[PDB]
């Protein structure tokens, strides 16, 4: 006979701001061509990557998230006191525990707010953004920080001519909160665990710890499998995201697919049939593939250069590791 | 002028069932404390732990989660096809990527469903349950699997007399779906990022990998500090959870605090002012502290012994690493 109470928050939520942080060190294609048999021109034409950013030895996924969050808050004209929760989405927090979220919250002056780490491969941002919107509309929070951060450089095998030039470091955060009108569309997501090996850490940490003299872990990438999967299936996920958002393809002002490979994204543009003048994120050129931090970093690049503008309707499509994807239509932040 | 659409789902949701998997191997206190000369009785008197289960070498956080989910599905009279998404909460998936969720979904035959891994230290379950409820009410899924799973045994330092006897292995999943009347109360969560070192892996994986000859990483647990914090703060957390759920202390039929210390749980029962005949979860006796899987495993133990019955009003309070906590009032599942 006892009835559990039901709570609810603001139905209309949106991106109040985006803040980005990219490590200082610039690493050129030729800088890694010392241990690989390819060239600078080959890399660019195959991936679209010219340069990449590597974080300093004293930096981590957590420290870069702190920096990204401070910038997002500043750009939103808010402080941690206005934040009710923080979701850190990453794949490079090199500690089984504790999670990064609490320490990140403390570093902003809000050591006590709720928060957790979200891992869904490269698509962690999409899932995190959706979970934040879900929590806020549900009344569990009013304003949140969602920060994608990655320090992939230490996981790269310089001798792997297959991906040594793909991954990079960086972090970008968005402030999610109430907005006059809906700014975040329904979440469209899924996965394919049958191809979980397409992007992976080859040796688990325990197997390594129980035999420290053997081969150490490194990130491996089966290029052909990822290309075939993403290039041919993300078109349909993108249409599902727009449909769920109740928007037509021609109404999309900006397209921000995961910055995994220029060639894959170029095919997605053709497949999605967006307006000929739609702006497409190409932050991969000098940022490389920063996994979970990829789309928020790309959004920031588009906004700081003027290519994209506040209010623009953007199609976000994250795809990657575990072979999971998350997409949604959103209104670009300020 | 374009209006981003808003979707909606079942307003009332609850735990349809719970499924638990406890590895076969029983490990006595002397077995992990054979490397220390401490009293067998002292461990039980101080923490309430007698034995714990350790997973086999061919098992992992992911494989145990899969089995837990199969059982949860069976107990709810549902099939993998009835599941729209799965959230795996753990702190012992020893791979930076790919995440465990896609793999678990594939293994269950729940092809392509959305999913992700959530790490909030030991309180991952409460956060994941709250996220599942939020996603369902938001219309992003109708029925979900939330599974806590941990394989902490490989991270235990047999020579650490401070925590060698604390952690254990196991997994438990719940099915979250629409229900006639609200079954999941509002989420009450938070943390203390300034005490991130209280429970932690002492050496990050990269530092170790760059010095394989040096010391191996292990999970450290500062008992004094963690229990001091728990005793001091969980009482208020429990009250906020009950208040949010609109229920009085005398209305709770089952109390399911994290299984970390029996004495603390006794202290909380009193502080929370629950009825003397309220059933208190003590699965810790032969399960130990299974971190993220602790609460759902404790719910199952209470239900399989008959101590608790489906429909009973229960108070869940998770707390642990990163110094996170997550609590909510819920109706016990099948």
From Swiss-Prot, chains A, B:
E.C. code: 2.3.1.301
CDD domains named among the record's database cross-references: KAS_III
Subcellular location field: Cytoplasm
Gene Ontology biological process terms in this record: fatty acid biosynthetic process
InterPro entries: ACP_syn_III_C, ACP_syn_III_N, FabH, Thiolase-like
Positions of region (ACP-binding): 259-263
SUPFAM superfamilies, per the entry: Thiolase-like
Cellular compartments per GO CC: cytoplasm
A single GO molecular function term of this UniProt record: 3-oxoacyl-[acyl-carrier-protein] synthase activity
UniProt pathway annotation: Lipid metabolism; fatty acid biosynthesis; Lipid metabolism; mycolic acid biosynthesis
PANTHER family: 3-OXOACYL-[ACYL-CARRIER-PROTEIN] SYNTHASE, BETA-KETOACYL-[ACYL-CARRIER-PROTEIN] SYNTHASE III, CHLOROPLASTIC
Complexes and interactors: Homodimer.
Family per record: Belongs to the thiolase-like superfamily. FabH family.
Role this protein plays: Catalyzes the condensation reaction of fatty acid synthesis by the addition to an acyl acceptor of two carbons from malonyl-ACP. Catalyzes the first condensation reaction which initiates fatty acid synthesis and may therefore play a role in governing the total rate of fatty acid production. Possesses both acetoacetyl-ACP synthase and acetyl transacylase activities. Its substrate specificity determines the biosynthesis of branched-chain and/or straight-chain of fatty acids.
Protein name as annotated: Mycobacterial beta-ketoacyl-[acyl-carrier-protein] synthase III
Organism: Mycobacterium tuberculosis (strain CDC 1551 / Oshkosh)
Gene (UniProt): fabH
